[PDB]
């Protein structure tokens, strides 16, 4: 199948990673807007973007 889902960030939880080049945000689904995840992003984001996810059960873990 093609379970491509979307998720609009509601807040950005600083920038993580050893490189210092990835960030961590709290995304909320376009559907069921009470269901949120924490996810890692690689690039410039701000409050308002719509990420595309091929997963929904994954949660972000701080990169070391």
């Amino acid at each position: 199948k093609t379970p491509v889902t979307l998720a609009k960030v509601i807040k950005v939880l600083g920038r993580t990673g050893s490189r210092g080049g990835v960030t961590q945000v709290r995304v909320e689904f376009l559907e069921d807007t009470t269901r949120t995840i924490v996810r890692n992003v690689k690039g410039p984001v701000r409050e308002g973007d719509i990420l595309v996810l091929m997963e929904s059960e994954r949660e972000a873990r701080r990169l070391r």
Binding site: E57, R58, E59, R61
Partner: protein, 129 residues
């Protein structure tokens, strides 16, 4: 009760290669044993949350084909004389079990904790690293 056919999830999450192993109420009958190392490549991420996630999806699918619709979580650490703290993957395994339609009842921790260890491996000065 509305005829929720029950099983016990009985997760075993060591610091490597977590286990998801659902059984009936008695526990004498074993179905859908699929583990963490069953589904992931690196041989080092058998303990990773993604490993337990895929293992949990497989056991959920197999049990749903069986007819069991609700499960009882029995989280177990490696136990014994070992670290006996729950592994990283077991929590993801439980979350994915609760995701895939299955109903959840009576989470228990059943790690084998001793009245004392016989002897803990590593010598008096322990693992030097």
């Amino acid at each position: 009760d509305n005829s929720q056919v029950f099983g016990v999830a009985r997760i075993f999450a060591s610091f490597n290669d977590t286990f998801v192993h659902v059984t009936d109420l008695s526990g004498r009958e074993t179905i859908a044993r699929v583990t963490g190392g069953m589904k992931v490549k690196a041989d080092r991420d058998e303990s990773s949350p993604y490993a337990a996630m895929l293992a949990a999806q497989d056991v959920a699918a197999k049990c749903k084909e069986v007819g069991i619709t609700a499960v009882h979580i029995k989280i177990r650490a490696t136990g014994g004389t070992r670290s006996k703290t729950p592994g990283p993957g077991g929590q993801a395994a439980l979350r994915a079990l609760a995701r895939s339609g299955l109903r959840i009842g009576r989470i228990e921790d059943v790690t084998p904790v001793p009245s004392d260890s016989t002897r803990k491996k590593g010598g008096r000065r322990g693992r030097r690293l």
